[PDB]
Amino acid sequence: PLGSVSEACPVCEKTVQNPCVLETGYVACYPCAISYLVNNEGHCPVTNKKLLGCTYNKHTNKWEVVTGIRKLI
Ligand SMILES: [Zn+2]
């Protein structure tokens, strides 16, 4: 089922803390989702799909997450 918070985080492999949903529907820790997308040029840690919601910042020469991460309460 979508949105479950009891699966391993696909980034850090631990119990998810501060869950959020990625553009691909998978759940990760909030800082894990942010850091993975920034560090991997906007690619999903589960599917390696190039995500629509990540944008390249020409000033910092780094990727940022503009849309596509949603927190779970
Ligand atoms: Zn994590």
Residue numbers in the entry: 2 to 74
Task: Share the article's original sentences.
Luminal peroxisomal proteins are imported from the cytosol by mobile receptors, which then recycle back to the cytosol by a poorly understood process. Recycling requires receptor modification by a membrane-embedded ubiquitin ligase complex comprising three RING finger domain-containing proteins (Pex2, Pex10 and Pex12). Here we report a cryo-electron microscopy structure of the ligase complex, which together with biochemical and in vivo experiments reveals its function as a retrotranslocation channel for peroxisomal import receptors. We propose that the N terminus of a recycling receptor is inserted from the peroxisomal lumen into the pore and monoubiquitylated by RF2 to enable extraction into the cytosol.
